[PDB]
């Protein structure tokens, strides 16, 4: 987090990128994990359609 926005980067070098479906995977509800946060996950397909 930049303080205002959320990104995803590699671990050994800073290179922020937008959180999309193509670089994340889904598993379960957002109540088991301790420390989860809310944000938008962008879907590339929908804007085209």
């Amino acid at each position: 987090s930049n303080g205002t926005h959320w990104f995803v980067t590699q671990r050994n070098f800073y290179e922020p990128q937008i959180i999309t479906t193509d670089n994340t995977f889904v598993s379960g509800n957002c109540d088991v994990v301790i420390g989860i946060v809310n944000n938008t996950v962008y879907d590339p397909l929908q804007p085209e359609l």
Binding site: R11, S27, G28, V32, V33, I34
Partner: protein, 49 residues
């Protein structure tokens, strides 16, 4: 860091986040048993002696 180490052996990271309490309890119990394992057995430290 523990999730990174789980990735290091071929297990995905959601396993740790969904079993965090169980894993911490197991670790604490094993550390608790080390004390007795050394103390009760008197021949553990033969190499140093």
């Amino acid at each position: 860091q523990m999730a990174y180490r789980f990735n290091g052996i071929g297990v995905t990271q959601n396993v740790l986040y969904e079993n965090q309490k169980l894993i911490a309890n197991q670790f604490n119990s094993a550390i608790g048993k080390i004390q007795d394992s050394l103390s009760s057995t008197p021949s553990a430290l033969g190499k140093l002696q």
